[PDB]
Amino acid sequence: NKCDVVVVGGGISGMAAAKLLHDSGLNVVVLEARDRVGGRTYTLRNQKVKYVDLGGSYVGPTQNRILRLAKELGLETYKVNEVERLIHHVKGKSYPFRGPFPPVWNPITYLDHNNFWRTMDDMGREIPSDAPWKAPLAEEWDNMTMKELLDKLCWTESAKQLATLFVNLCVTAETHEVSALWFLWYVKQCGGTTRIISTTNGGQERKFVGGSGQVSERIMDLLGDRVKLERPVIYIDQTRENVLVETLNHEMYEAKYVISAIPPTLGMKIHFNPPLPMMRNQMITRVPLGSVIKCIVYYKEPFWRKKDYCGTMIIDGEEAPVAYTLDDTKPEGNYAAIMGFILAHKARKLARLTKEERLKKLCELYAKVLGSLEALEPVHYEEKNWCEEQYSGGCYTTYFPPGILTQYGRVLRQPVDRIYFAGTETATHWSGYMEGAVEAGERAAREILHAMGKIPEDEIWQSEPESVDVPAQPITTTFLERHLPSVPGLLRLI
Amino acid sequence: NKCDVVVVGGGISGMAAAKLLHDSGLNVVVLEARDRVGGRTYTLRNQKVKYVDLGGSYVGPTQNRILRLAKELGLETYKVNEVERLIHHVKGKSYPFRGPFPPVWNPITYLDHNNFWRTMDDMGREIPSDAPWKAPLAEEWDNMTMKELLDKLCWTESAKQLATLFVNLCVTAETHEVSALWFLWYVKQCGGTTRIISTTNGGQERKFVGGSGQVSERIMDLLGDRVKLERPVIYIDQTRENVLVETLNHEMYEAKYVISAIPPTLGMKIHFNPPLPMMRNQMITRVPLGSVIKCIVYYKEPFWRKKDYCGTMIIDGEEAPVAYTLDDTKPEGNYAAIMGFILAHKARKLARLTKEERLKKLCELYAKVLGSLEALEPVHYEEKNWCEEQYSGGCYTTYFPPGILTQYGRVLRQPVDRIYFAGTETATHWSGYMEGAVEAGERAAREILHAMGKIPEDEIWQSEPESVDVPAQPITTTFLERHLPSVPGLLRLIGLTTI
Numbered sequence: 001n002k003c004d005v006v007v008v009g010g011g012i013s014g015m016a017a018a019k020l021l022h023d024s025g026l027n028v029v030v031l032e033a034r035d036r037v038g039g040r041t042y043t044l045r046n047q048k049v050k051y052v053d054l055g056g057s058y059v060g061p062t063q064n065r066i067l068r069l070a071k072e073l074g075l076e077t078y079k080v081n082e083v084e085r086l087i088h089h090v091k092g093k094s095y096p097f098r099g100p101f102p103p104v105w106n107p108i109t110y111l112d113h114n115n116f117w118r119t120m121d122d123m124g125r126e127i128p129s130d131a132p133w134k135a136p137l138a139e140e141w142d143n144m145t146m147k148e149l150l151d152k153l154c155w156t157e158s159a160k161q162l163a164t165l166f167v168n169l170c171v172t173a174e175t176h177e178v179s180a181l182w183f184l185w186y187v188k189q190c191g192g193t194t195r196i197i198s199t200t201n202g203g204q205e206r207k208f209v210g211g212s213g214q215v216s217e218r219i220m221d222l223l224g225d226r227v228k229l230e231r232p233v234i235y236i237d238q239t240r241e242n243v244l245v246e247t248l249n250h251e252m253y254e255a256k257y258v259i260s261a262i263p264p265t266l267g268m269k270i271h272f273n274p275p276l277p278m279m280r281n282q283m284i285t286r287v288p289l290g291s292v293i294k295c296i297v298y299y300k301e302p303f304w305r306k307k308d309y310c311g312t313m314i315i316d317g318e319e320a321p322v323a324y325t326l327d328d329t330k331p332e333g334n335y336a337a338i339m340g341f342i343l344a345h346k347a348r349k350l351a352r353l354t355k356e357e358r359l360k361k362l363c364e365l366y367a368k369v370l371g372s373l374e375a376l377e378p379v380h381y382e383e384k385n386w387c388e389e390q391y392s393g394g395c396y397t398t399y400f401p402p403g404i405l406t407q408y409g410r411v412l413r414q415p416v417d418r419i420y421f422a423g424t425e426t427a428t429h430w431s432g433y434m435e436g437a438v439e440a441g442e443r444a445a446r447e448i449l450h451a452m453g454k455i456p457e458d459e460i461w462q463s464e465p466e467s468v469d470v471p472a473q474p475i476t477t478t479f480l481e482r483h484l485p486s487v488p489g490l491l492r493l494i
Numbered sequence: 495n496k497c498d499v500v501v502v503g504g505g506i507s508g509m510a511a512a513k514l515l516h517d518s519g520l521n522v523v524v525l526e527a528r529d530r531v532g533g534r535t536y537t538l539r540n541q542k543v544k545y546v547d548l549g550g551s552y553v554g555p556t557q558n559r560i561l562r563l564a565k566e567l568g569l570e571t572y573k574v575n576e577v578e579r580l581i582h583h584v585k586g587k588s589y590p591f592r593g594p595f596p597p598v599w600n601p602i603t604y605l606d607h608n609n610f611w612r613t614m615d616d617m618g619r620e621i622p623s624d625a626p627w628k629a630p631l632a633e634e635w636d637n638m639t640m641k642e643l644l645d646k647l648c649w650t651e652s653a654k655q656l657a658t659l660f661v662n663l664c665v666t667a668e669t670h671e672v673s674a675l676w677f678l679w680y681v682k683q684c685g686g687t688t689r690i691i692s693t694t695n696g697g698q699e700r701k702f703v704g705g706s707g708q709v710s711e712r713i714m715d716l717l718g719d720r721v722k723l724e725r726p727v728i729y730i731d732q733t734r735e736n737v738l739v740e741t742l743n744h745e746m747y748e749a750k751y752v753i754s755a756i757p758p759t760l761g762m763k764i765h766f767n768p769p770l771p772m773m774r775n776q777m778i779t780r781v782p783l784g785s786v787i788k789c790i791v792y793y794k795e796p797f798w799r800k801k802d803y804c805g806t807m808i809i810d811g812e813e814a815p816v817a818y819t820l821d822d823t824k825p826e827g828n829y830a831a832i833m834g835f836i837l838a839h840k841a842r843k844l845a846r847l848t849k850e851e852r853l854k855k856l857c858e859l860y861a862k863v864l865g866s867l868e869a870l871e872p873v874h875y876e877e878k879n880w881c882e883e884q885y886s887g888g889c890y891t892t893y894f895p896p897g898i899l900t901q902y903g904r905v906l907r908q909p910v911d912r913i914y915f916a917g918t919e920t921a922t923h924w925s926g927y928m929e930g931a932v933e934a935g936e937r938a939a940r941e942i943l944h945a946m947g948k949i950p951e952d953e954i955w956q957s958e959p960e961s962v963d964v965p966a967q968p969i970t971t972t973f974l975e976r977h978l979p980s981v982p983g984l985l986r987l988i989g990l991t992t993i
């Protein structure tokens with residue numbers, strides 16, 4: 001009934017915000033639509049897998065907020081297996097490699113690949129994390145899809161196919177669907193290309209022991225009966241002294257402040273009185289989430305390691321159902337598994353098949369790529385299609401189509417009276433990740449503390465000391481990588 | 495509580511559906527979110543204007559369903575004023591003309607203009623009205639914004655600038671926001687470029703006497719108490735034998751079938767049990783409506799007519815708040831008025847101003863365009879920003895960004911168990927218009943009649959006799975229009991001769 005703050009949504013962001021408010025002595029209620037907490041994180045436990053993350057899972061250096069929160073909740077990390085060689089599968093053949101960037105040998109292709117990565121980061125350096133719409137060339141870059149940019153930039157088919165995979169894999173959408181400005185902001189606000197694509201010393205370095213769902217579950221454990229499961233919010237009324245929040249199951253909650261910790265577009269599921277201001281009213285219709293199926297195939301042993309492969313596979317082309325894989329084996333070396341992502345249009349296409357049909361296709365692919373018949377002998381299979389979720393709308397995060405970020409980007413975390421906005425989409429560092437969810441939850445919480453007089457304005461945004469357990473090493477480039485010409489650069493000279 | 499069919503939404507589509515169902519003997523209920531029917535049509539009445547349409551207004555030849563419905567409800571139409579000259583305002587100057595297309599004199603620019611319009615229609619003929627995703631190059635065209643298409647197609651800036659205005663004005667969105675396949679489909683399913691842009695012989699030929707809001711009101715009068723105002727639907731449950739529909743004011747309705755007659759994205763406001771299938775679940779997060787303010791400036795007399803201007807202005811430029819106007823003077827010749835549209839990014843930009851600051855900017859623009867100080871002396875002003883409507887989401891209609899129509903398009907009117915989809919967005923002819931609303935509403939109602947075994951399958955889609963009051967002159971082209979070369983095609987003639 002009556003409380004200080006209603007939080008809408010029990011994902012990591014909402015739970016992080018509720019915890020902060022609780023710890024400062026306010027009465028918080030969390031209204032969660034599902035029969036569980038965690039949102040776009042979900043850890044399934046059964047005897048065959050023990051535990052498996054079917055949503056968000058990876059953390060790495062520079063993600064210091066999710067690591068601090070998780071450590072305080074008593075969680076620990078382990079390292080994703082990258083001891084042996086990575087595989088780039090191109091034109092029906094596997095090429096083993098080391099280091100984060102799939103290498104290339106033809107000298108024109110080399111210049112073209114080097115330039116592509118380098119240009120993503122150069123363009124990034126002119127985009128403010130906290131305001132990408134303030135980039136000098138914001139309108140120019142926002143009025144282009146990533147398909148347009150790649151067509152201009154990539155002089156070789158080899159670079160264009162890897163660039164396309166890069167976009168597909170990072171934001172679960174086609175190059176033609178997404179704004180160039182948004183995608184470049186997105187890479188930049190994760191620390192750039194090397195950081196975003198790296199296992200060792202990057203975003204996929206680590207997983208949580210027991211699964212990432214433990215973050216939300218363990219905060220629910222703290223808050224007790226303050227978390228209301230199967231309470232989808234349908235109605236928020238701000239006309240009176242206190243804010244009134246109504247759920248689908250007819251309950252009414254009364255508060256001084258509200259935090260909306262849901263994906264922007266899922267805002268549409270709530271009827272507002274008074275109506276939302278114009279810009280938010282339209283913004284929440286313009287911000288879809290991507291399309292992905294996360295798939296985990298279990299095997300008797302991690303057989304790929306015997307052939308000096310780590311289990312990472314980068315798989316070019318339209319034919320392959322999965323473009324990217326990591327070893328999902330447990331740190332103890334058991335529950336051997338390969339994790340794969342089915343991305344974008346392939347998620348839509350392959351979801352018509354049965355579970356068994358998807359398993360068969362994945363096993364045949366992995367057999368080809370790893371060059372092993374052992375891949376044809378799976379002991380178990382788990383998957384989750386995030387497209388079918390009424391209360392996610394997809395995964396991993398919200399993408400911005402051409403034109404939207406510059407016109408509506410400002411409104412994303414703009415308070416509407418006593419509603420403040422959280423969720424990973426509103427973060428400025430690792431937005432789209434669990435790290436961003438924490439940053440945005442805590443920030444929105446401190447906005448309400450400031451509105452109440454408890455803290456000064458300069459404490460709303462707070463820095464995070466570096467994790468002692470997951471220290472970040474610097475991103476380095478070489479002289480040649482910095483100064484080698486592009487293909488059109490090499491043409492000018494001749 | 496109990497009925498045969500709940501219709502969600504009391505716009506033209508919903509009310510047309512309800513009417514057909516009621517006339518066939520079923521018990522129907524219409525649940526409407528607002529305190530009025532009409533949706534994206536809305537006629538304001540006060541003593542200063544008598545009546546004015548702040549939403550959908552114009553009807554024309556080939557729109558035979560809305561004309562037939564309006565006639566059956568006892569409504570009349572009148573012709574929009576196009577007696578005198580149109581104005582094309584470009585780079586700070588006004589160029590009067592006649593006929594639908596702004597003309598050009600420079601021969602190179604002429605070939606480019608002619609080729610732009612012709613290619614729009616050429617690509618359109620490749621695209622099935624009922625299945626745009628079946629066009630041979632559907633994928634190539636849908637992976638492309640209209641901005642990319644115009645950059646490839648227009649060899650002059652003159653043509654590119656006019657083509658940009660054509661997109662902005664027809665779909666209230668920027669060229670970079672919209673799919674090429676979708677836009678080309680949209681134009682084609684209205685009967686092509688000439689039909690869509692024309693006043694005489696086109697979309698903007700006529701208006702209803704007393705306003706277009708009478709269509710929805712008069713159907714409400716036929717239905718009596720079966721229309722429920724201030725019932726926003728929040729929840730649809732299809733787990734049991736009968737469908738349960740719940741409203742925000744805690745009322746429950748029980749029906750055999752539901753027609754959803756709301757814009758696709760406003761489907762997001764409804765919680766579904768069981769959950770929507772994957773494809774529709776994602777589709778309704780991907781289909782926004784455009785941005786527009788409709789503004790009407792009233793004057794003592796229609797002074798433009800005396801300068802031999804009909805009141806139509808096609809206004810190009812970033813500084814212009816309004817890109818298109820029509821004479822909105824009553825047919826009796828009184829309540830002289832200029833109707834204008836503030837489009838796309840300009841609706842957003844200029845919504846920051848007060849009502850009086852917008853009035854001033856409009857008058858100054860009209861003064862310049864018409865060469866008339868009288869334009870600075872308005873007697874009244876009315877406007878409506880459709881962007882702020884919770885239960886519309888924008889106007890005129892839904893646009894599709896790149897990649898969406900080929901991937902999600904086929905689920906737009908695909909039933910979900912016992913929910914059928916109306917709304918103008920689901921039409922195959924004048925989708926986006928009041929015409930499309932009627933087609934979609936009556937088609938969805940008949941899908942239900944078929945499901946109940948009351949009509950055979952071949953009667954779901956029903957053709958419409960031509961209006962005898964508003965006959966359609968066919969779209970014709972001249973020999974030169976058909977065979978004059980593109981700009982690159984002239985350059986190919988030059989390289990082939992001199993070799």
Ligand SMILES: *[C]C1=C([C])[C]=C2C(=[C]1)N([C][C]([O])[C]([O])[C]([O])[C]OP([O])(=O)OP([O])(=O)O[C][C]1O[C](N3[C]=NC4=C3N=[C]N=C4[N])[C]([O])[C]1[O])C1=NC(=O)[N]C(=O)C1=N2[C]/[C]=[C]/N1[C][C][C](/[C]=[C]/C2=[C][C]=C(F)[C]=[C]2)[C][C]1
Nearest residue numbers: 009011012013033039040056058233395423424432433434
């Ligand atoms: C799904 C997913 C997946 C599958 C995956 C992933 C993910 C996801 N991610 C993301 C995450 O998860 C996120 O971000 C988070 O979680 C979010 O949070 P928040 O914000 O909180 O939100 P959510 O969760 O959603 O929540 C919300 C809530 O609310 C609710 N609701 C609704 N509505 C409502 C409600 N309530 C009440 N009422 C109402 N009305 C709901 O229900 C919920 O609960 C992630 N993340 C991280 O961090 N990590 C990870 O891992 C993840 N994942 C992913 C990733 C992927 N990747 C990375 C990158 C890589 C790449 C690499 C490379 C490239 C290139 C080359 F060449 C190489 C390499 C891979 C991929």
Ligand SMILES: *[C]C1=C([C])[C]=C2C(=[C]1)N([C][C]([O])[C]([O])[C]([O])[C]OP([O])(=O)OP([O])(=O)O[C][C]1O[C](N3[C]=NC4=C3N=[C]N=C4[N])[C]([O])[C]1[O])C1=NC(=O)[N]C(=O)C1=N2[C]/[C]=[C]/N1[C][C][C](/[C]=[C]/C2=[C][C]=C(F)[C]=[C]2)[C][C]1
Nearest residue numbers: 503505506507527533534550551552727889918926927928
């Ligand atoms: C808004 C608007 C405006 C401003 C204008 C316009 C329009 C609009 N349009 C459109 C119409 O209006 C539409 O389409 C219709 O109306 C639709 O219907 P429907 O489908 O039925 O839908 P609605 O209305 O929306 O309804 C719905 C309902 O529902 C409800 N809800 C929601 N949600 C809910 C509910 N309920 C319960 N629950 C829940 N949850 C609501 O409330 C409602 O009621 C139009 N149309 C027509 O036909 N006409 C017209 O006029 C119109 N408008 C416009 C036009 C424009 N334009 C045309 C074209 C031109 C061009 C020219 C040129 C170009 C170029 C050159 F060169 C030259 C020239 C322009 C203009």
